[PDB]
Structure 1
């Protein structure tokens, strides 16, 4: 196809939860659009200064009134969210995914994605990487690797609070598998009931380029396979190598495309 000059604004809002292929999707959107896509890894590796900004936004989010019409308080919150996303062409992952409805209002010309997978595979992946049970010995290893990356209690608070915001819960028993599974199913159901279907594409892991590129009116990138990164096995290796070498820069060359 012809090359056209794309606007550097949010063009794709992905509502999928962590551990549903968000990093591969992030990489895929950056291959298509040649501009950055938001993701929790953007915060971890490029923009830890954003942690407090996302925390402030979640803290004030209860004041949003779903538009239309637009209230004064909502505009103030939307302005901060637009500021956080300046320079990006898409959003994925926590902490953005719980804001998908508000992002749809801020960027009316953006298309919406929902990545989904088997709920038990999701939970298993979540427990290995993002939300290990309190008494899981592996939690201590993740925390040791987190410290190497400069991630402290404020990051943990953002993870918890942005998950609670996505699930619309005032509090959450993070150690209760049944609660998480029910929140997952309810979240994915609500996305599909909220987003007009002409504006939504549901992607399952393994769908690859074709449905995505058709939805976005772009050509399939020539000779580039659809990304497959961020398996829990690979994250486990990253945690162990962070613990072994005690720096990211000692090992980053060992983790292409993930970092």
Structure 2
């Protein structure tokens, strides 16, 4: 069974959170980039996005946690599928979130590719764009409004004993306290960068 359902949007330090959760023994942790490493997973996520019934174990059987897209948009159904899992809402200053989103994802998500190998990913992020962002990615006011409303929704649905709201600026102490898992003294909190994986996809 899944232990942790990550409900925060991408660009909230998710690759660093992924690493931190794995260090605490709470992985393997799924991330957006896992969909490229798991054969057939983008097909399954597109089926989920279309509203089809998919057995969640076909995606998550070998995982114990998830962060980022694509799963964050499905936090409500995943929290009901895995009732014992905790929910982790990764957050960030809204201006910095949008800066990172427009520097990292908006060009890619807005692109066309002849490459049949990006086609499934593009289908998925086109769905997210339509369903979550109302068809616009290049508008800071609207995108920040979407981010802030998403975070409000999660906080208003999941009971506060089951939800941890976390920004990577806070470091280890809140994860370790919420999950009751130690990290060695003087361990720096991971600050990892996945920008190149997305920026290099098109080329």
Global fold match (TM > 0.5)? yes
Q: Which residue of 1 aligns with 2:61?
A: 86
Length, aligned pairs only: 203
Pairing 1:93-104 to 2, within 5 Å after superposition:
93-104=68-79
Checking the alignment, whether the CA contact within 8 Å between 1:13 and 1:113 is kept in structure 2 is yes
Which residue is 2:45 aligned to? Answer: 54
RMSD over aligned CA atoms reads 2.8
Q: Which has the higher helix share?
A: 1
- Gap regions ≥5 residues in structure 1: 1-8, 62-76, 244-259
CA distance in 2: counterparts of 1:92 and 1:26, whole angstroms: 7
Of 15, 25, 28, which residue of structure 2 is paired with 1:36? 28
- Aligned residue in 1 for 2:171: 208
TM-score, normalised via structure 2 length: 0.87
SS of alignment partner, residue 94 of structure 1: coil
Who is 1:12 aligned against? 4
What does 1:203-242 correspond to in 2, within 5 Å? 203-221=166-184, 224-230=187-193, 232=195, 235=196, 239=200
CA spacing shift, 1:12–1:237, aligned 2, 3 Å: closer
- More relative contact order in 1 or in 2 (CA 8 Å, sep 6+)? 2
Using the size of structure 1 for normalisation, the TM-score is 0.69
The offset of 1:221, in angstroms, is: 4.1
* 2:110 is aligned with 1:132: no
Q: Check whether the contact 1:13–1:100 (CA below 8 A) recurs between aligned residues.
A: yes
Match of residue 153, structure 1, among 119, 139, 156: 119
> CA 1:158 to 1:32, structure 2 compared with 1: closer, same or farther past 3 Å?
same
> Over residues 114-171 of structure 1, what are the superposed CA-to-partner deviations in whole Å (9 max), with x where a residue is unaligned?
1111111111111111112899xxx79xx79xx6xx8422211212313544x3x6x4
- Greater C-alpha radius of gyration: 1
Report SS of the residue matched to 2:61. Answer: coil
